[PDB]
Design a protein around this ligand. Structure first.
Ligand SMILES: CCCCCCCCCCCCC/C=C/[C@H](O)[C@H](N)CO
Ligand SMILES: CCCCCCCCCCCCC/C=C/[C@H](O)[C@H](N)CO
Lengths: 297, 58, 242, 245, 49, 242, 49, 99, 58, 48
């Protein structure tokens, strides 16, 4: 047991999270009570201290003479599921015929949703996210035409050998999940679970993943979080010989069962690289717009 | 419906009403979230809570 | 062979259609969640935090971009002069664009409820003064004198021990929700003006500096509500990323 | 009853008479990891009063043309004391913090400061000015040590995010009219129950002067800013030899 | 293949076909071909009044 | 004509989609099953059997491929020397590749739980000795002396009647699951090192031989768990079978 | 794979067919209605003037 | 030398902590390891050639023709399973023809 | 559901929960296996079982 | 930065104008004698 008095009356090992807040149900907005004129002393609801750090707790009734309003505006639009469950373009894969980009009928795409600026600015509002997904692959010619072509999507988890070419023996998908679609049908749609070793994704990871003397050669590994490297997406024209139709694949991701932690400021500058918050050094643009003076509009 | 319980929500105070046609619960629809707010977490994160009727620094 | 009949809406791809899709990994249990502090459950929780309102959006160059957060006050001739004015639209290109309410109501079409603008005085301790912070409901143009601007909703603010006042902008509206106002026909959704007039003066003794500064911080109330999620307007993107 | 406060933890004590309030980060106190959240199978060590104490880091110089500074936590505490000697030997690490920034002036000085806690503050560079080269910040700028680093473009916080929305995270203001200190209690914010203490910096402290300093000729011209911080509910797991980086 | 896009009042209109407003991160879009039944949506009462 | 509506995901072939398919043989009863011994019900039952760990993967040629199962010990100068070292990653190209745990965790992406490495001494009966088997959590490089390597988790093993010790590698991790480590950014999932140091010496009398051998056998614990089934990595195949 | 069978009347667009269609805005509550005088409930009310 | 494996618990070797482990073992079962369709055979039908120039081809049923499926099923000696075959037909250039 | 019982599992200790739309039970889905392990079959297949607290050969 | 590691008290000036650094009884013995130069440095209390 215990016989000392500085341990039996101690607080070492407090595991529960002593919370000061308690979440209350709020299905609609808050109403307004009737307030009359008030000309008293000492009780001031308009004077605060912004040096404390907390925000304003001034009700509308304690500043003007209000009317009783039974407010019935629903707040079911601003939730996390009603904000992120809209599929946006996260990647585009090219498959040309005669060129230098992908002239062998296959292309490998690493999985990251930070390639296009419109989806990237929404998900970088928070720091940690935890979501499922519904991918959608819409394939068409560069002129928008639909051709009778068969395609194979393959999800390569991190570690598995990537295909070197179109006739390689990694396309036999004995355990990799693959999707076989033509182009004359509705586009494919899968459901990807939360596939991370951590408890949540993170789009901002301050630090290095390795140890050792970080010099000028190993500086590009900064901010590369390996709890987010989810593998490689691969496509091919299912066949042996050369095809004759050019292809363009577009990927659309929508999140469901979303939980988010630790909000942060949203970016105002232009993006420049993937998984790298660089900006233009000379062209620092302000957030708002400028006018002539402050005394006039 | 007898299925697996392995969605990205399980172990929370939010109760869903979704539809699902498979054996795993991460393929279900988004559904109707419960509407529970907490303004006291980001707006008034102070130790001693002061009344709005009183000036804080006296 | 069950009898059925395909009605239109078939073989479409709606980007917002909620439905069951085909899972790729069978009998897969994910990583269990741990207690991470700071869990949001709504986006009305980021509306009620105060953020700096760029009232003095006069300077342009990159070496003086930090000056766009505060606006100066000084000693006048004592005629009830004007300090600063700005519109009260959180969906317009102006001072409200650099708040947490101006970026989270850029992703929505309509909004409701009361705004509030919390000021803060960053001057000396031995320097006092009084300011009149008047809010004008729409229709009324920029006033030419403090005697004209007193007729709206206004709050007289004295400097002292406490150094912050909260002008809550009331929800004076004919509609339940109002959209984002801009030039043309969409002036119907204008919220008004907020003007800051010198009530008495800025009095300062010997040894203390001449020019002080005020920082404006804007927030939202507990009856704020947004609707009709859209794409953000007050941003662009250059072509050819990488 | 509210202007004066005292922080007693360990064998250190901070007494201040011009304090505003003690903010609590996200309404959550620092604590020890429960058996549900725990991943490791070895018993974690926990020095009680030998690491939960205040460490006065360094004295800065708030001049007229200052821009700002930033300190990456917990990089600043790898060379100081028993905490700086436990994080070099151990592998896993878990602690809250308690940050207290003193900045004093007379009743004839004016100015303000913004003391912010930004979790996973990722430093980004200017990409060669024009935005063509894929440059990366060096090791002496990413993890600066206990001496901090001066911000080069404080309007975008050297990370692309604007300064005007920084107060959505934890913020207290050192306004030299009413108060002189800003005290923040930060819980442990990470996706993992434990973490390495030599590469991953959890959050970054940001001290930027919003309203500038001003005084007339005759007052003393130097105003110092000192950071004082104390870990709380520190835990360590997994022994090895002493490695520096 | 065709893309319908509902642009709410305020959002930036596309200047051309290759513009970066077509990436529909929050706008509701409908992707149909022409060799299928025609698209059909359901629009609620979307007025401030 | 029942009203319906085809949503996307239509006319796809997902290789992992579980669903009812069309049977080809009606009213067909198969051959009844008899009691065959050795029925597996999980693949965590093949994790907990010990298999030979190729610690001495120095030789190359086909005439000496049997030498890659055991590593030699002998008489030293008595300075606390080093015998052998190997990494503790069961998803890396190394000693763990030729176990039942290195081929069944080649078909999975992430793993959890404690490993264990059971050694065995195959020397004379009249020859004794002591070995220090130290495990280093990551971050710490290859130690230069036994005084540096003693600070990790270590087990001192004496030779005698019993001739096998079990160094269980503890699950010292920040994450719940860890993936397979390799060169580059994926050093974040490294497990560490296991080194074998001469504690005292290898003492041998007259008539008994000089060089003995140790065989390493690796297994898994009862809290081992794998996840996210994938394709195997540490194998290839030549083209044109037959 | 549920057994089914497409009967004719498939892939048609009847302009008067009443059916459930795909909504575009999820969890969307519209503007509440107020008491406006002059609510018709039939078109036999404009016959009798 | 006995032949059995190690029964050493983690608690009997180091000083442990109480961990309520909730990692599910529903991924390593037999149904969650083999119910992934892999390529087991390929049948050619050319026009002018010597392999199958008569518009038909006969394929004997064996799943041991391709090395990626063969290595998984030869982990065990005796198996007892149903199947779900799937026949994806296309031109050698991937094109779909009305045939 | 009145159907034939001729799947490749019948006569085992594992109880399934599957869906089926035909008359024969080998066309049903894979379903949710029961989680029953047996480590004592391949790992400790010895006649006299020794305690972990005691050395076996004395 | 070196002297911060002991027992210390940060003292702000203001309305109250007195702080009390209580020196703790950090000792190996129950009583300590009067220290001076030589062998009697064993009873030294420290520095402030
Ligand atoms: C046929 C399989 C379809 C492919 C499915 C891919 C599943 C991967 C999960 C997607 C979840 C988003 C991953 C987020 C990571 C971000 O890119 C990084 N944090 C930043 O680079
Ligand atoms: C239209 C009918 C489709 C054809 C259906 C074929 C049914 C045959 C059952 C397949 C089960 C695998 C047979 C396994 C046998 C291995 O090839 C031999 N043991 C090794 O050659």
């Amino acid at each position: 047991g215990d016989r000392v008095a500085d341990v039996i009356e101690s607080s070492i090992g407090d595991s529960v999270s002593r919370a000061l807040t308690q979440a209350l149900p709020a299905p609609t907005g808050q109403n307004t009570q009737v307030s009359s004129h008030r000309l008293d002393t000492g009780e001031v609801p308009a004077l605060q201290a912004a040096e404390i750090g907390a925000s304003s707790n001034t009700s509308d009734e304690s500043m003007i003479e209000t009317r009783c309003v039974l407010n019935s505006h629903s707040t079911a639009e601003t939730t996390l599921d009603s904000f992120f469950s809209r599929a946006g373009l996260v990647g585009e894969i090219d498959l040309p015929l005669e060129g230098t980009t992908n002239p062998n009928g296959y292309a490998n795409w690493d999985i990251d949703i930070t390639g296009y600026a419109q989806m990237r600015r929404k998900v970088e509002l928070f720091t940690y996210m935890r979501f499922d997904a519904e991918f959608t692959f819409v394939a068409c010619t560069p002129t928008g035409q639909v051709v009778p072509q068969l395609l194979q999507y393959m999800f390569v988890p991190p570690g598995a050998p990537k295909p070197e070419s179109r006739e390689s023996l990694a396309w036999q998908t004995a355990t990799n999940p693959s999707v076989f679609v033509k182009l004359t049908d509705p586009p494919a749609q899968v459901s990807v679970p939360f596939m991370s070793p951590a408890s949540a994704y993170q789009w901002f990871y301050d630090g290095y993943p390795t140890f050792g003397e970080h010099k000028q050669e190993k500086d590009l590994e900064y901010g590369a979080c390996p709890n987010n490297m989810m593998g490689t997406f691969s496509v091919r024209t299912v066949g042996s010989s050369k095809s004759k139709y050019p292809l363009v694949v577009r990927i659309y991701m929508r999140m469901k069962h979303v939980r988010a932690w630790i909000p942060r400021p949203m970016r105002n500058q232009n993006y420049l690289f993937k998984a790298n918050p660089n900006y233009a050094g000379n062209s620092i643009k302000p957030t708002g717009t400028s006018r002539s003076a402050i005394t006039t509009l | 419906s007898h299925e697996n319980s392995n969605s990205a929500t399980e172990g929370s105070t939010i109760n869903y009403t979704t539809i699902n046609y498979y054996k795993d619960s991460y393929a279900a629809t988004a559904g109707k979230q419960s509407l529970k707010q907490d303004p006291d977490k980001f707006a008034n994160p102070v130790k001693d809570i002061f009344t709005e009727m009183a000036a804080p620094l006296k | 062979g069950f009898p059925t009949e395909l009605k239109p809406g078939t073989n479409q791809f709606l980007t917002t259609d909620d439905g069951v899709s085909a899972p790729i990994l069978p009998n897969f249990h994910p990583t269990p969640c741990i207690h991470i502090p700071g869990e949001v459950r709504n986006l009305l929780e980021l509306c009620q935090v105060e953020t700096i309102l760029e009232v003095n959006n006069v300077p342009t160059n990159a070496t003086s971009l930090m000056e766009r957060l505060r606006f100066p006050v000084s000693a006048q001739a004592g005629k009830g002069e004007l300090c600063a004015v700005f519109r009260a639209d959180p969906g317009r290109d102006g001072p409200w664009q650099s708040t947490m309410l101006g970026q989270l109501c850029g992703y929505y079409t309509q909004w409701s409820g009361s705004l509030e603008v919390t000021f803060m005085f960053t001057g000396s301790f031995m320097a006092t003064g009084k300011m009149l912070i008047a809010y004008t409901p729409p229709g009324g143009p920029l006033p030419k004198d403090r005697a004209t601007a007193m007729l709206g909703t206004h709050v007289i603010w004295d400097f002292g021990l406490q150094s912050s006042v909260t002008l809550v902008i009331p929800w004076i509206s004919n509609t339940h929700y109002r959209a984002h106002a801009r030039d043309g026909v969409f002036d119907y959704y204008t919220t008004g003006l907020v003007s800051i007039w010198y009530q008495t003066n800025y009095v300062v003794p010997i040894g203390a500096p001449n020019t002080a500064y005020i920082i404006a911080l804007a927030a939202a109330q507990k009856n704020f509500t947004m609707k009709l999620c859209k794409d953000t307007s007050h941003i662009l993107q250059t072509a050819s990323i990488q | 009853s509210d202007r004066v406060a005292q922080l007693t933890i360990g064998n250190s004590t901070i007494t201040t008479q011009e304090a505003a309030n003690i903010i609590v980060g996200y309404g959550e106190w620092p604590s020890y990891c429960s058996d549900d959240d725990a991943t490791a199978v070895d018993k974690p060590t926990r020095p009680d009063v030998s690491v939960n104490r205040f460490y006065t880091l360094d004295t800065k110089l708030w001049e007229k043309s200052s821009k700002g500074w930033y300190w990456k936590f917990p990089d600043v505490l790898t060379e100081t004391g028993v905490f700086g000697q436990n994080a070099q030997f151990h592998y896993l690490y878990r602690s809250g913090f308690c940050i207290h920034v003193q900045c004093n002036a007379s009743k004839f000085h004016q100015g303000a400061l913004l003391v912010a806690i930004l979790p996973e503050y990722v430093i980004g560079t200017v990409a060669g000015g024009t935005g063509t080269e894929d440059s990366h910040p060096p090791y002496k700028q990413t993890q600066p040590g206990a001496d901090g680093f001066e911000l080069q473009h404080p309007y975008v916080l050297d990370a692309g995010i604007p300064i005007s929305q920084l107060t959505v995270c934890h913020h207290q203001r050192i306004n030299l009219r009413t108060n002189n200190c800003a005290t923040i209690i930060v819980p442990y914010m990470n996706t993992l129950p434990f973490d390495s203490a030599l590469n991953h910096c959890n959050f970054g402290l940001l001290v930027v002067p919003i309203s500038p300093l001003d005084f007339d000729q005759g007052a003393t011209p130097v105003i110092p800013i000192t950071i004082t911080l104390a870990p709380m509910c520190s835990e360590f797991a997994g022994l090895r030899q002493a490695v520096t980086q």
